[PDB]
Amino acid sequence: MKTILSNQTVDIPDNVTVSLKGRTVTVKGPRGVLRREFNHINLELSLLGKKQKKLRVDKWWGNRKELATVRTICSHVQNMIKGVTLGFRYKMRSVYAHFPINVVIQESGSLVEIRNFLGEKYIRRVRMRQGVACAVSAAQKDELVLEGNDIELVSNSAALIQQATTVKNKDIRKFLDGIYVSEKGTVVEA
Amino acid sequence: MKASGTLREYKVVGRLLPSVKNPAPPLYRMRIFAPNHVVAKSRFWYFVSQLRKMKKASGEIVYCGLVFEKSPLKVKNFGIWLRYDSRSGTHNMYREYRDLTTSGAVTQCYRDMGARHRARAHAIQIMKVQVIAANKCRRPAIKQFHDSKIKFPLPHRVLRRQHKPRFTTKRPNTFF
Amino acid sequence: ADRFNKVLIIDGRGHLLGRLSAIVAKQVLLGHKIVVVRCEGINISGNFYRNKLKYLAFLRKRMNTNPSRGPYHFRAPSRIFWRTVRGMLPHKTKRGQAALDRLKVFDGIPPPYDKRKRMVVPAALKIVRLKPTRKFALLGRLAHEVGWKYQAITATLEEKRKEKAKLRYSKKKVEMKLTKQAEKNVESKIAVYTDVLKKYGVLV
Amino acid sequence: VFKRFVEIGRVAFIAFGPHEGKLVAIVDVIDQNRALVDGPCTGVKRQALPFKCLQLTDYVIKVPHSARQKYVRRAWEKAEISKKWEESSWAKKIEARKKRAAMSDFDRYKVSKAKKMRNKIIRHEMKKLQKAAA
Amino acid sequence: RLWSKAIFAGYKRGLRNQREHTALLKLEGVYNRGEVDFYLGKRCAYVYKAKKKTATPGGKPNKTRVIWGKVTRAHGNSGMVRAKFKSNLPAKAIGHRIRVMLYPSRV
RNA sequence: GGGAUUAUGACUGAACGCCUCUAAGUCAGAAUCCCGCCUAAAAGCAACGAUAGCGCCGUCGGAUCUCCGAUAGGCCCCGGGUAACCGGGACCCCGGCGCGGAGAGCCAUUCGUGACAGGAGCGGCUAGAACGAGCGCCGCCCCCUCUUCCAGUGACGCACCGCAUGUUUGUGGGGAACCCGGUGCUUAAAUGACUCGUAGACGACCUGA
RNA sequence: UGAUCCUUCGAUGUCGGCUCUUCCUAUCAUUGUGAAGCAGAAUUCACCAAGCGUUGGAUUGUUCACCCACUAACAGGGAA
RNA sequence: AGCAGAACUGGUGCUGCGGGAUGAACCGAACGCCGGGUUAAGGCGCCCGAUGCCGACGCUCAUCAGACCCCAUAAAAGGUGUUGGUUGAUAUAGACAGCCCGAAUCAACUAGCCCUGAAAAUGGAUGGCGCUGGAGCGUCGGGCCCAUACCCGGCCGUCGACGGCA
RNA sequence: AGGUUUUACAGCGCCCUCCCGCCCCGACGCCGCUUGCUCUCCGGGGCCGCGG
Ligand SMILES: [Mg+2]
Ligand SMILES: [Mg+2]
Ligand SMILES: [Mg+2]
Ligand SMILES: [Mg+2]
Ligand SMILES: [Mg+2]
Ligand SMILES: [Mg+2]
Ligand SMILES: [Mg+2]
Ligand SMILES: [Mg+2]
Ligand SMILES: [Mg+2]
Ligand SMILES: [Mg+2]
Ligand SMILES: [Mg+2]
Ligand SMILES: [Mg+2]
Ligand SMILES: [Mg+2]
Ligand SMILES: [Mg+2]
Ligand SMILES: [Mg+2]
Ligand SMILES: [Mg+2]
Ligand SMILES: [Mg+2]
Ligand SMILES: [Mg+2]
Ligand SMILES: [Mg+2]
Ligand SMILES: [Mg+2]
Ligand SMILES: [Mg+2]
Ligand SMILES: [Mg+2]
Ligand SMILES: [Mg+2]
């Protein structure tokens, strides 16, 4: 069936400025500027209110496939609001049995060189995405913190490192070596 | 049955042929929806011959006339009880429609039974048609139009008249 | 248009391959000269991977004994559209071969047509004939990934063409603002002539 | 982003069909395709018209859903829809398109002579304001 | 100019049978079956040029020739009309210009 | 040597308060695929050289014979978006939006020749290369404009006696011939034989005179 | 392999090998993977996948077998 | 078995024509030579006559989609793809899900389309192009297209005349 | 579910009456079937009038 109306509002904090140009959400916060173009979901994005106006997402005459994107777009804007205020901290730890995984960060956190993975002589150079800065965390042995505004860039940067330390031609249940995401948090805790 | 166009409602009444053994046999009234009265009389001898022991030659048709809509200008909720024979078996089915006339709602049922279940007109047997109140509607697609102060735009107007100007420098607007 | 034009110049951007080819092939049979520009802007319904597989399946149709005689798999979006129109013409006859001669296809808008008005066929547009939830494949990207080697230069000369056309449109708007300003200054000098146009619905 | 909605009382313009060119009031919504329209002051009896033939205007009357023609007419005259319509530019484009379609050969001659001289006066000062700007 | 533009789109035919005694014309701005009522009965003309000169009624002899005809009826729902000429139109004229005169006038 | 990706492993994230590689949207990804490199070079084409009494602008060449097409006012130009867009003004505001700042329109365009009143061809400059302008912007000569529209007064242009191929682009495009006043260059090339042997059945090919 | 007898009896040269080209994938090997009763090594199951390779010999006219070695593997077939 | 052998009837052999792309046999319809009209079966994005209807409602996305007698293959079994339907059970004495929160949820079954199941050899076949608000599927409306069929007329011959003239 | 509890600051049914309360439109661009011989110098298009 076709649902007449499916709406979902998104509250916007006062320290955030969300502007709309059609289906292009430009979120402005104290940490930076995020801009996602939603020209593919075909929704109605209204900015209701005058004092820190909210964001209302409408879908008229949408089937089950189209109503599923109403909360998807709302959840994406909430990540853009959460990214420009609290940030995203995808910290991951290096797990190894015998050969310590030596990870050195270069290019101001934009390049990650992984060495001594399973005793291999090949150096794995994982390059981060724009807006993501990597660093060897302090007060922890083999922790690797990733900070940024866009969750999809901080998360994909962590997946690039996790898939770079993949064991081939071995029992991955036995050889648990690698750098796996341990916590998906924020830069600023609230 | 073909279900050509609208399916007008006919009140077809009939009875067995009277005899000296059974004078004045019982009269049976049916609620037949057919495109014309010829099909309505033929549909009568199909549903009655399988309920009573009377064929077209064993009995006669006493009256066959149109049943007009008593409120053609009022939006009504129609609950239709029907049975149809699919490719595997026969299934009892209740469907709700929303039309101005009873014959229009039954016509929607034949177009919908063929669209969603690939049922042909000869495989459908409309058992009961009833004007249902808005409180007793079971389908959510009907209950969404049971909202006072209903409001919705017409988003993304598909361009018709695509060949009146077949060639033009103007790309069509879809927002109105 | 719809006026039996001498040369009908159609823009290819936003149009569907077979939807436009069906109408173009009918025009060239009626004796009309059709020029379809920006054939890389044509889009085909269905996701990109589907339409690419259809062309990859067409690439494999070579003649076994001698591929130099086999199907000539043209990679440019112009010749791809040209063959789609050829498939809708009796090109093995004299009236069908003369129909292909009335059709000229171009990747982008060459100088002979960058200073012309491009038409649009609303019965073949993607925004009209496709639901907004359906996937479509751009013929420019499809051609580039099957062997077209002139996509970057076509995109470079097109942005050079748009920046040049944008400069004129700015001058054309200035000339229009002075035109509307002129109508207000001679309003009392043309009031007798406006009433003739107002009386017969020429001006609202 | 939408400003014109299908609501109870929305004055709609019949784009095509039997009563093409006349205004009706959406009294009730039957389905996602049809509506119960009723033009009491425009000459359109109450009936079911599809949504593809209706063009929503900017006018809404205060009428309950599925109300009688007696009360739809009162809301149509209170809001002065017929007056507000004829003053709108879209209604004036319809009148101008009818006057132009009814032009005779003598009317097309008088118009040809008017635009031929009217444009020359506009084009002459357009060249004057263009030279003054340089 | 006192004639509307038409196109000789082909002969009246099915799919595998062609009837050359009737021609199908394509009027310029006529794309409905209801708009062809004006042109029903108007004289058609296929004006062409040959090598040898021929007599011209009301003028000097030139190499211009013509095959006269008339719009007989409507064909389809897209403004196409059927036309019968004094001689069957040559197939080389398929897609060329046909003159639809304003006479016999009924307005 | 690259590209898009397959299998696959993932990201964000709903549907389904959780979850989820998928639904929308993203990432990595291969002896595959396509391309590059490489080989061929089209009834495909470009630049450039040289062009034997032969050819040009003549200015609108004048007046003649032959073919071959059509056509019968227009070579009207933002980019584009579509759950939006357009115009104007110092991101905001105003205005328009079944889209008259409209390709359903717009711009043209509605018989002449001569006596009357109203109505508003040379030099500079900059620019165009995707298959280049039937270019533009200035200031000086050429006459006096049926420039265009509305009104007139007294005349003639066969008014060819009801009749078709009229009317446009058109000063069209190809030939070869024929008369008048000014300019280009006439130490052009290919090929045969001979020669060469980096070549080769024969032609062809590489050469040299 | 049969069953059938439709085409061919004023003829379509008949087994195998040699030779040579291309094709199919129901993948032996190689590339990228998933699964295990995957610790490693080896092996098995499965997926994308026919790009590339798939041998030298003894015996037999042999296709088919069998054995000797070699090898990443010595996969199976079609094209009268 | 496109095998072999029968029964009824039709067809075909002996037969062209419209349609099924193609074709012996299917569908329509059987044929003197023609003009006009209208149909059948089948069709009307383009090839290719005709929907260039502002056709109705719904279903459907396929990284082997689908696309109509004969007919040019596909099954058992599956899908938390998606849309209907059937029959139960928990629920504002607070369910389901997540770790209190506050309103529908859960289960079985079934039926459409789609998907998996689904591997062959020269390169290739809804006929081709292509089509995805459709040119697909189902239910239908209006208009339209033409057969050597039907209707009207002209002509030829044959047949018949309960026919006409010495 | 309009107005603040069922008509109130909108409306929507269903009964009992009031001559069917009474008047008015009769399938009318809201929905059917037809002449009881439908009427029209009532229009338009195409085709051809052969013989005698
Ligand atoms: Mg191992
Ligand atoms: Mg890559
Ligand atoms: Mg994937
Ligand atoms: Mg990638
Ligand atoms: Mg505004
Ligand atoms: Mg004078
Ligand atoms: Mg036999
Ligand atoms: Mg022989
Ligand atoms: Mg033989
Ligand atoms: Mg032989
Ligand atoms: Mg395989
Ligand atoms: Mg297994
Ligand atoms: Mg037999
Ligand atoms: Mg016989
Ligand atoms: Mg037969
Ligand atoms: Mg077939
Ligand atoms: Mg006939
Ligand atoms: Mg066909
Ligand atoms: Mg099944
Ligand atoms: Mg299974
Ligand atoms: Mg299912
Ligand atoms: Mg399948
Ligand atoms: Mg007869």
Swiss-Prot record, chain B:
One of its GO terms (molecular function) is structural constituent of ribosome. One of its GO terms (biological process) is cytoplasmic translation. It is found in: Cytoplasm. GO terms for cellular component: cytosolic large ribosomal subunit. SUPFAM superfamilies: RplX-like (SSF160374). The keyword Ribosomal protein applies. Component of the large ribosomal subunit. The ribosome is a large ribonucleoprotein complex responsible for the synthesis of proteins in the cell. Keywords: Cytoplasm, Ribonucleoprotein, Ribosomal protein. InterPro entries: Ribosomal_eL20 (IPR028877), Ribosomal_eL20_dom (IPR023573), Ribosomal_eL20_eukaryotes (IPR021138). The keyword Iron does not apply. Belongs to the eukaryotic ribosomal protein eL20 family. Component of the large ribosomal subunit. This is Large ribosomal subunit protein eL20.
